[PDB]
User: Which sequence fits this backbone?
């Protein structure tokens, strides 16, 4: 839908390939959910990539502090298992959210039942989140790509 | 009767505890009798284990470092390993006891009288004689076991011999 | 409830029958799996170090890695939680376990199959008791 | 916008509908906890709470107790957790017998009694499971 | 003798106060008699 | 079935319960099988995704070597498949209501194989004839792929 947040941009509504042109409300809601999940995950991924690149490593990961893709190996299988468990717990919470009648895509704060009235500033700030998230998605995929192709790694003239 | 008068005096003195079943009540009698029956079983088993040395024997005393200052008796002395072993054999049953006391099986008899209910009628000097797994048999055997514990303990204390050795003296001297 | 009253002795005076039939079934199914547990290893063989090499004896209890006991308890707890979700919360009124569905539509078929399961399970109980008699009297 | 509005649309009650107090996240998270979940017998609520709080409690005693440096640290921690659980169940029983005196919602004599029995069983289960897990790790 | 303190001190310092406080708590807020 | 012909056997023709669930199972098997065969082909001619796999005689023995080396990948794949199926259960099949055994009845008015995955609207639902013909094409290519998967496990069999 054109009214939902994220639209404000130089491009305006950006749907070259028809995906929301005839999509039922369920499919558009799922598309927005995916966009927000990817965007937030990418924002965190870029921030973590910056943290690792700058040498900022936890005391428990002393040896590996140079290349994030290299650092990924240092994590034992059970560390990744616990990452997955935590993400699954949050996903279970969000699934419990979506059962509530008045759910809007990505509004895990229940803004509809919280705001005194729907506002334009709220839409603009949701758009800010979506835009920084889209940029973070592109930037994170680009970071991984540029570091895989050229092994020198960011901050090393990459 | 004298027993009835004593029970009435207890009821008047401490109505709350008597109501809940605490004190001289048939529920308490049954519980103590069951415990005493198991206790006779456990004393027989302890004697047999002492005879066959299954218990680590008093030659060995628990190390202070591993078992902490709880093992300390007085100062340097430490609880013997046999006393610890018997205590643990008892701790198993005590853990069971708490579990079954606060979370009784629905068909199980509660430890305390239910709020609505009242204690069952008194058995009397000679409880009604009926064989098999019937309440009267259980109560009679519990009374017998508790009396036996009392009088064997009296024997051991008066003569000065250990309780286990007094039990050995009885039977046919099978145990030790 | 669905076996018919030809019981050898009286124990049901002070115990509800619904829970007791459920316990009959639980213990019977576990006993069938346990009889297989004490037959199949001996007949077909144990298949790894087992943390200590032994078979045909109860001692495996101590030899088996506690990891296995933990995971087995977890599995049993989760399956029992689902089975409790049935028959006591949602009262689904259809059998909890029926992939490749059996258990005929007619009520009489239900009763007959329940009787068959009870018989096969009681026999397994007796067999497991005899096995433990073989082992440790 | 305005994310802070009076709770229940009642300006004169001592509460506010802040994002922490009244948001889909918190309502759904608290509404699925055993203490507030719908369609749970009080026994099940107690069992869930006890399982959560028993496994949770072995660790501090095990790792920071006086016997933490001995080879029997885990057993001492488990025993301390068991004792504390027993104390808490005593507390629960007395609270139930004092509060609700003149199966249902958890706020009743029988409801609270079932909750406490479930809590004891679940807490001992959690402590035992934590012991089993830590015994080999 | 030399065994009693181990038995009694825990009872007097833990079990006795625990049961005493439980009973006092029950009686203080009994709301009847 | 294919064209306007009838089934090739006894063909569960006496299924009082509607065949919708069996048709859903058929289309699911077929989609899995066609993905499997196309994958297998690409793997046999191209294998860059998981290096250090040593020698792979054919696609059949690749899973064993991956388990040996990349054990976590199969856990991740199983997670993905399971979560996807659970998510599908929402818009396919009828929920439990003290009856309606779970995963037993396709919801009324829902053509089998419809998970809503129509991003490019290549198959026009409005045009009934075109949509039905495309469904038939999918089903038949999928049956062919299902046969082909075993015809390929023959590659494992010969050696
Ligand atoms: C731990 C368990 C767990 C569970 C139960 C879920 C459950 C869910 N997730 Mg979440 N998720 C998890 C872990 C989990 N996720 C983790 C660890 C991540 C990474 C940080 C994500 C990232 C994530 C995103 C970004 C999205 C979801 C979505 C979803 C939903 C659809 C899932 C699906 O169909 O998978 C099917 C899985 C696939 C089809 C695999 C896709 C792989 C992509 C195409 C490329 C992979 C590249 C390579 C691996 C790197 C569902 C609510 C989606 C959603 O809510 O939209 C409706 C969505 O957009 N999840
Ligand atoms: C997409 C999100 C994402 C993913 C997949 C990872 C994954 C990883 N990170 Mg990174 N990280 C992230 C976001 C992410 N991080 C963010 C947002 C921060 C800023 C707080 C960090 C800060 C960070 C540091 C300082 C270190 C890692 C490390 C690691 C590795 C071990 C896990 C760990 O210690 O986490 C640690 C996670 C946190 C400290 C906080 C997470 C906060 C969540 C997102 C809320 C693993 C490869 C460690 C490593 O292997 O060395 C490079 C390490 O030393 N990360
Ligand atoms: C004083 C604080 C304290 C201490 C010393 C411990 C100590 C421990 N915890 Mg506990 N824990 C605590 C607070 C604490 N916890 C709190 C506040 C929470 C959240 C409410 C948890 C939740 C928790 C979980 C969920 C688990 C532990 C586990 C553990 C063990 C981790 C090491 C291990 O694997 O054993 C070697 C260890 C005994 C783990 C355990 O039992 O080990 C298997 C485990 O699974 N803890
Ligand atoms: C008021 C007098 C008094 C005081 C202050 C103490 C103090 C003590 N006694 Mg001793 N004791 C006393 C009288 C007293 N005793 C008498 C008369 C006897 C003969 C039965 C004993 C026999 C005795 C033994 C056999 C042992 C102690 C031990 C102890 C110590 C631990 C407490 C304990 O376990 O009690 C246990 C005491 C009893 C079971 C009997 C009760 C003691 C008196 C009679 C109670 C007086 C109550 C008082 C009037 C106030 C009541 C109000 C109160 C409820 C608030 C402690 C230093 C233990 C020890 O040495 O540890 C190192 C130990 O093993 N006591
Ligand atoms: C005055 C009586 C008294 C006695 C006899 C004890 C005895 C003990 N305390 Mg101390 N304590 C007391 C009062 C007392 N406490 C008071 C008033 C405080 C508050 C200031 C404390 C604060 C305190 C701390 C902070 C700690 C102790 C600890 C300990 C234990 C020492 C460690 C050890 O070797 O055991 C090893 C312990 C075990 C093997 C666990 C067994 C635990 C119990 C005995 C199991 C049975 C409990 C039973 C079911 C409860 C009945 C409930 C109800 C009926 C009363 C020991 C059992 C330490 C401890 O427990 O370590 C974790 C510890 O860290 N105590
Ligand atoms: C697990 C695999 C699977 C499943 C569940 C089904 C299930 C079904 N098939 Mg399919 N089919 C399969 C594999 C499968 N088939 C394969 C491998 C082939 C290729 C030989 C076919 C070729 C086929 C034809 C040609 C026809 C069916 C038909 C049918 C339906 C009823 C008749 C019958 O059972 O025969 C039923 C929904 C019939 C149908 O759809 O009736 C309208 C029909 O005409 N099937
Ligand atoms: C039933 C289907 C199926 C199964 C079980 C497998 C299983 C396997 N494949 Mg094959 N594959 C498949 C379909 C399948 N594939 C299809 C349809 C393609 C597209 C041509 C590929 C392309 C492919 C390549 C190029 C390679 C593998 C490899 C492998 C192995 C390692 C996993 C991997 O990297 O795969 C990669 C799988 C994909 C990228 C799947 C894309 C298509 C799926 C079916 C759609 C949905 C997946 C999900 C949303 C993620 C999409 C990721 C995105 C990049 C497209 C593993 C044995 C690797 C190997 O070691 O071979 C020996 C390897 O190098 N596969
Ligand atoms: C011969 C190949 C083939 C063909 C012709 C089709 C054709 C079709 N598929 Mg199928 N599909 C295929 C392969 C194929 N699919 C494979 C390999 C997969 C596995 C990824 C799927 C998974 C799939 C899903 C999950 C769905 C479709 C759906 C559809 C329909 C959507 C309209 C369209 O195509 O645009 C259409 C009848 C959709 C449908 O019928 O409902 C709208 C639908 O939900 N397909
Ligand atoms: C549960 C159980 C069981 C069982 C148990 C029981 C049942 C027991 C019983 C027990 C008992 C039951 C005991 C008893 C005892 C008794 C005694 C020991 C007695 C004594 C007596 C006397 C001492 C006497 C005296 C006298 C005379 C001489 C004459 C008369 C008078 C007078 C009194 C003086 C079993 C085995 C299965 C095992 C497990 C546990
Ligand atoms: C994530 C995180 C968080 C939180 C966390 C938490 C809070 C956790 C918890 C945890 C827990 C809390 C856990 C628990 C667990 C438990 C368990 C696991 C249990 C188990 C149990 C069992 C197993 C039982 C058993 C039994 C019984 C019941 C009885 C007896 C018998 C038996 C043994 C069978 C936050 C966000 C804040 C932050 C970050 C991190
Ligand atoms: C109905 C019917 C019929 C027919 C039947 C048939 C013939 C069936 C078949 C069926 C089939 C025959 C199916 C198949 C399926 C398949 C599938 C479902 C597949 C899967 C696959 C996968 C899962 C994959 C795997 C893999 C991996 C893992 C890695 C790489 C390699 C590969 C790719 C292999 C008739 C006409 C007689 C009539 C009567 C009834």
Assistant:
């Amino acid at each position: 839908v054109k009214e939902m947040p994220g639209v404000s941009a130089p491009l305006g509504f950006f749907d070259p390939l028809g995906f929301a042109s005839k999509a039922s409300p369920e499919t558009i809601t799922k598309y927005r959910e995916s966009e927000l999940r990817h965007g937030r995950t990418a924002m965190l991924a870029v921030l973590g990539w910056a943290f690792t690149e700058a040498g900022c490593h936890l005391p428990v990961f002393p040896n590996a502090g140079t290349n994030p893709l290299a650092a990924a190996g240092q994590v034992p299988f059970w560390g990744w298992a616990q990452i997955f468990a935590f993400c699954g717990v949050i996903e279970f919470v969000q699934a419990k959210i979506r059962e509530r009648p008045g759910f809007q895509a990505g509004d895990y704060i229940g803004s509809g039942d919280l705001m005194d009235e729907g506002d334009d500033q709220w839409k603009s700030f949701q758009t800010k989140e979506l835009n920084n998230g889209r940029l973070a998605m592109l930037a994170s995929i680009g970071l991984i790509g540029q570091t895989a192709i050229f092994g020198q790694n960011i901050l090393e003239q990459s | 009767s004298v027993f009835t008068d004593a029970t009435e005096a207890f009821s008047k003195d401490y109505p709350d505890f008597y109501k809940a079943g605490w004190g001289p009540t048939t529920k308490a009698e049954r519980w103590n009798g069951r415990h005493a029956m198991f206790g006779w079983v456990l004393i027989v088993a302890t004697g047999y284990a002492k005879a066959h040395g299954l218990i680590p024997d008093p030659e060995v005393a628990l190390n202070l470092k591993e078992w902490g200052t709880l093992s300390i008796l007085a100062g340097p002395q430490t609880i013997s390993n046999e006393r610890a072993v018997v205590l643990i054999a008892n701790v198993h049953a005590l853990f069971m006891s708490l579990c079954a006391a606060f979370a009784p099986l629905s068909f199980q008899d509660p430890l305390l009288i239910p709020k609505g209910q009242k204690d069952e009628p008194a058995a009397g000097l000679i409880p009604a004689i009926v064989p098999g797994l019937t309440k009267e048999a259980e109560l009679l055997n519990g009374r017998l076991a508790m009396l036996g514990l009392v009088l064997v303990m009296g024997h051991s204390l008066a003569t000065g011999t250990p309780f286990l050795n007094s039990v050995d003296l009885f039977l046919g001297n099978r145990l030790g | 409830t669905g076996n018919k009253p030809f019981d050898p002795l009286n124990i049901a005076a002070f115990v509800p029958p619904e829970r007791m039939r459920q316990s009959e079934l639980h213990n019977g199914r576990v006993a069938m799996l346990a009889v297989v547990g004490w037959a199949f290893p001996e007949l077909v063989g144990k298949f790894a170090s087992e943390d200590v090499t032994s078979t045909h004896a109860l001692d495996a209890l101590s030899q088996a890695d506690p990891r296995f006991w933990t995971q087995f308890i977890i599995l049993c707890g989760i399956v029992e939680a689902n089975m409790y979700r049935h028959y006591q919360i949602n009262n689904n009124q259809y059998p909890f376990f029926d992939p490749l569905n059996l258990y005929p539509k007619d009520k009489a078929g239900q009763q007959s199959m329940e009787l068959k399961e009870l018989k096969n399970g009681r026999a397994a109980m007796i067999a497991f008791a005899a096995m433990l008699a073989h082992a440790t009297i | 916008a305005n994310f802070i509005k009076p709770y229940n649309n009642d300006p004169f009650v001592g509460h506010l509908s802040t994002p922490v107090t009244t948001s889909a996240a918190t309502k759904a998270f608290l509404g699925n906890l055993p203490a507030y979940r719908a369609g749970l017998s009080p026994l099940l609520r107690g069992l869930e709470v006890g399982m959560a709080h028993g496994y949770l409690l072995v660790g501090p005693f095990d790792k920071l107790g006086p016997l933490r440096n001995s080879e029997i640290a885990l057993l001492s921690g488990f025993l301390s957790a068991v004792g504390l659980i027993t104390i808490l169940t005593l507390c629960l029983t007395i609270y139930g017998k004092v509060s609700f005196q003149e199966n249902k919602d958890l706020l009743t004599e029988d409801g609270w009694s079932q909750f406490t029995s479930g809590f004891l069983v679940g807490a001992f289960g959690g402590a035992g499971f934590a012991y089993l897990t830590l015994l080999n790790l | 003798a030399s065994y009693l303190p181990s038995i009694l001190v825990p009872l007097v310092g833990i079990v006795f106060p625990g049961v005493a406080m439980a009973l006092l708590f029950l009686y203080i807020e009994k709301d009847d008699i | 079935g294919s064209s306007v012909f009838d089934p090739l056997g006894l063909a569960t023709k006496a299924s009082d319960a509607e065949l919708l669930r069996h048709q859903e199972s058929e289309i699911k098997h077929g989609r899995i099988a066609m993905l499997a065969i196309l994958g297998m082909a690409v793997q046999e001619r191209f294998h860059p995704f998981f290096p250090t796999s040593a020698e792979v005689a054919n696609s059949v023995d690749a899973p064993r070597m991956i388990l040996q080396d990349y054990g976590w990948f199969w856990l991740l794949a199983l997670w993905g498949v399971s979560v996807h199926e659970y998510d599908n259960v929402k818009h396919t099949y009828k929920p439990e209501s003290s009856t309606v055994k779970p995963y037993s009845e396709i919801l009324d008015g829902r053509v089998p194989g419809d998970l809503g995955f129509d991003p490019l609207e290549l198959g026009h639902k409005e045009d009934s004839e075109y949509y039905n013909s495309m469904r038939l094409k999918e089903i038949n290519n999928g049956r062919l792929a299902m046969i082909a998967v075993f015809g390929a496990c023959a590659q494992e069999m010969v050696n």
Summary: The helical segments of chain B are 2-13, 15-20, 26-52, 64-67, 81-102, 135-159, 163-169. Residues 23 and 38 of chain B are 21 Å apart (CA to CA). Residues E 4-5, 8-9, 12 surround chlorophyll A (ligand 4) (CB under 6 Å). Chain B touches chain E at residues 73-74, 77, 79 (CB under 8 Å).
